Write a protein that binds this DNA or RNA. Structure first.
Ligand SMILES: [Mn+2]
Ligand SMILES: [Mn+2]
Ligand SMILES: [Mn+2]
Ligand SMILES: [Mn+2]
Ligand SMILES: [Mn+2]
Ligand SMILES: [Mn+2]
Ligand SMILES: [Mn+2]
Ligand SMILES: [Mn+2]
Ligand SMILES: [Mn+2]
Ligand SMILES: [Mn+2]
Ligand SMILES: [Mn+2]
Ligand SMILES: [Mn+2]
Ligand SMILES: [Mn+2]
Ligand SMILES: [Mn+2]
Ligand SMILES: [Mn+2]
Lengths: 80, 107, 95, 100, 103, 86, 103, 95
DNA sequence: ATCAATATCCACCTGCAGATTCTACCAAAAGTGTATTTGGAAACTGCTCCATCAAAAGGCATGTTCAGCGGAATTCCGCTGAACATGCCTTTTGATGGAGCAGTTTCCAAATACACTTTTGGTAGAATCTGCAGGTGGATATTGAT
DNA sequence: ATCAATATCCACCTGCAGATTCTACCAAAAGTGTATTTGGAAACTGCTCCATCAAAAGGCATGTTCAGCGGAATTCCGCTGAACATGCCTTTTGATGGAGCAGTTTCCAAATACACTTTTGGTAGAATCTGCAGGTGGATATTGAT
């Protein structure tokens, strides 16, 4: 069992429902996973770059928050 | 003593805001005497505007504490704040809404 | 243990004048603090860009004011400016 | 025996209501934590994570995917369907400027 | 007939000819003076007595045509997604809702 | 010492100009309602940009809107322009 | 006397770049000796990458001077430059393209 | 005063090295001039915050490098970092 | 339209996680008084370029006519997702060493600052050079009738 | 498939606008050389909280079944493209007065740099407090079969 498959149909189905979606094609599950992988790669890459620069080995909430902000995806509620 | 903030009739920290402005400066730049006052009044005002709507959102739910969900309700529900606050509010969810064409049985 | 400044107590005071009998959860306060930090940053940033465009070194209340007109949507700006002129006045006239 | 079945689409509308009412996270936690750590491992090894960091990543991802499902639905409805398909997610990402 | 049927390109043929043509050129496609009046008129309704460096107006025109052209590419994707080849107001609206704009 | 009143200049963005813009954007067929929609969308876009440009102009106490004013206004709204400044 | 640029083996102006960093400083801000050097190298390198590609395009069009149209074909044409340069390039038009379902 | 700084003489030098018999129109040079200013403002900006987040007041070559890794796409970053490194090392080899 | 199976709703209830009221200590703020410093306003004014008016002519907008074919309405059928209930494997939760993240103090390599001398990019201006816009013409497509 | 009608592509060709090549100059830039200052790498360390591990919780994978969705097919009205006639208004070229922008210089209200004193927001450990999430029950609504 590959990690990305830990993001299961049921979880993907719940996200879509909160998104007001009514009926889901079967191919949607793999596509959503690719999309999440790309989103997470873009953000983690920036978080880890802030970590290394600070010479730490622990990615912190702030590193994630500054990474999200850099990408135009500002998040409130975790510092900064 | 009085204090800049009290002297201006504000709750927000004029002294602190001032200090902070001296650090968002052009190498050797200066900060006007009143600039901090003005800034502090602007932050105080917006904070009041959001608490006021978040506060109504919680009273209309017969509850005492403003939560992230209340803040999400107040912000996405007001055209001007919605426009100004693009950040994701952790724990806020979305405004309920189902497209007319999905709601159905039709006839 | 080094001090982390926050706007929490000032947010709480403003809360009290607005809904004297309402509270605010921890997670909600954290959001408000992020909101206040974010808005101050966008404002000081525009104001210093304004100063630089005009070959000036001082960030005066006049830059803070144009920055508010550039950052806030109509009504919000109308009142905010109004709240700003009003604090400066009350402060200019004092001892 | 007991023959009771809801019509296709009735439970689905009930789910939309339930999930738009609530605010909790919807992806199970450990699975998401594992995914995060694996993606990070390709950028740097022996990394640890504050707990609040993994949580911020999960809050950002879910807000992103939920909002992407809203635009995706708009694209399916624009094409007169009620079923979202990969081409709708694609059209939506293409217009957002994310391309992929 | 006598001088028989005067030649006529089928609907769509000249339109494709046009996309090839404008896509390979770079000139401003909106006439200049009328676009300058539109600018002066909108500016005036915000603050009277304003003057304009001529390059300020040229900057707004370049920005505007670059914004419209990119909006018609997105609108064209919404029409085709709907199996049409004709762009409609609903295609433009869909593109702007997804882009996160409004009006 | 004179005049001239500006009115309805949005009709100066003519149907042929809109068709040219759509051709460059790769559009093959255009419905009849696209033209008034495009005008409305251009008016809003210019209003937002001219509004910010004029705000920089006034801030600087000038009466002349400069190419720089337009360029900073385009930048604030995320629509960077190269060729005059940026 | 060797210039800091010459000392670094660069065409881009180190002294000036150092000056500009000191003035975008931030109060008690300091600018290290080598920060301007590294900056001039990134700037000179990006500039080199864009001209290399624009110059190839002005050449496949049997022409000597690079125009905004060449800068635009070069940038939209390269995945990474396209991603890095979102600005509108005045006078560059677009990359020719027609959707298969329109042909 | 009146004299305005430009990067045009430097862009010309670089153009001569990559395309010895190629010229550049003034419109094109204008774009290159904006492009360079834009990239520099973006790098200095990221380097400042970067320093800020770490409670540092000095912007070193180390901040510029991280700024560059955050701003450029994969491959452009590698080559730029290696050219940045090369020029620092050479520069310090004279002092 | 009549049941029957279930979902939904609301009044009420209580335990504990999250909030709060309390005391105290202190590095750092924040305010006052006094002295030096300087940015930028006010004023004079040189000098660019913006509004404007003039005239001439053809590129291009407007308005019409006509019919091709695209959009949208309807019909219909195969198949794909929704619903569901059986079956156990993975997540969640609460408890515990030790890894790093922070706080602290040391002390020099590095960065500021100022004085002298030198090298240079910007710019003003008469000036001789040249790439290419855009017009011309004929060779090769491309298109649409039949 | 031939074939008449246009469109397009392409390489040659040429007057000039936009470019590249000096001449003379000058404030500001940029580097050399001492003097004074200090930010933060470097080492040591205490204790938060991150990884891990056992047990208790509960959501997911699975296979069947068929309702109803998507899309293929077919029809057809009416709207949009193509072509054409007519002529207007944008473009082009030039000169003109002068609004307003921008350079230079003087001088003070406003802003900074200490020194000194006093209040305060943040943090620690604790005691008692409480809003409300989450669970009940019973009334009523909803949904789907007949
Ligand atoms: Mn809806
Ligand atoms: Mn008007
Ligand atoms: Mn295509
Ligand atoms: Mn001065
Ligand atoms: Mn006419
Ligand atoms: Mn059709
Ligand atoms: Mn250790
Ligand atoms: Mn020189
Ligand atoms: Mn040509
Ligand atoms: Mn120190
Ligand atoms: Mn159907
Ligand atoms: Mn005047
Ligand atoms: Mn206190
Ligand atoms: Mn409840
Ligand atoms: Mn019950």
């Amino acid at each position: 069992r590959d990690n990305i498959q830990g993001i299961t149909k049921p979880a993907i189905r719940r996200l879509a429902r909160r998104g007001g979606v009514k009926r889901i094609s079967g191919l949607i599950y793999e596509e959503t996973r690719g999309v999440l992988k790309v989103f997470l790669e873009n953000v983690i890459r920036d978080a880890v770059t802030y970590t290394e620069h600070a010479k730490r080995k622990t990615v912190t909430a702030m590193d994630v928050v500054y990474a999200l902000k850099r990408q135009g995806r500002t998040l409130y509620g975790f510092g900064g | 003593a009085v204090s800049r903030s009290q002297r201006a009739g504000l709750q927000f920290p004029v002294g602190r805001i001032h200090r902070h402005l001296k650090s968002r400066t052009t190498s050797h730049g200066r900060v006007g005497a009143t600039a901090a006052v003005y800034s502090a009044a602007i932050l105080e005002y917006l904070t009041a505007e959001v608490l006021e709507l978040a506060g109504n959102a919680s009273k209309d739910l017969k509850v005492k504490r403003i939560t992230p969900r209340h803040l999400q309700l107040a912000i996405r529900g007001d055209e001007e704040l919605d426009s100004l606050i693009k950040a994701t509010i952790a724990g806020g969810g979305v405004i309920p809404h189902i497209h007319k064409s999905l709601i159905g049985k039709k006839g | 243990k080094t001090r982390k400044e926050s706007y929490a107590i000032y947010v709480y005071k403003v809360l009290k004048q607005v809904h004297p009998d309402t509270g605010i959860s921890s997670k909600a306060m954290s959001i408000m603090n992020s909101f206040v930090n974010d808005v101050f940053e966008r404002i000081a940033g525009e104001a210093s860009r304004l100063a630089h465009y005009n070959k000036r070194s001082t960030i005066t209340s006049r830059e803070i004011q144009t920055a508010v007109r550039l950052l806030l949507p109509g009504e919000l700006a109308k009142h905010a400016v109004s709240e700003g002129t009003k604090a400066v006045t009350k402060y200019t006239s004092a001892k | 025996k007991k023959p009771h079945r809801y019509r296709p689409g009735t439970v689905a509308l009930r789910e939309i209501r339930r999930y738009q009412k609530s605010t909790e996270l919807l992806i199970r936690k450990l699975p998401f934590q594992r995914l995060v750590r694996e993606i990070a491992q390709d950028f740097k090894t022996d990394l640890r994570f504050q707990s609040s960091a993994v949580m911020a990543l999960q809050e950002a991802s879910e807000a992103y995917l939920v909002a992407l499902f809203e635009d995706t639905n708009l694209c399916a409805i624009h094409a007169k369907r009620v079923t979202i398909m990969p081409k709708d997610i694609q059209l939506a990402r293409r217009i957002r400027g994310e391309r992929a």
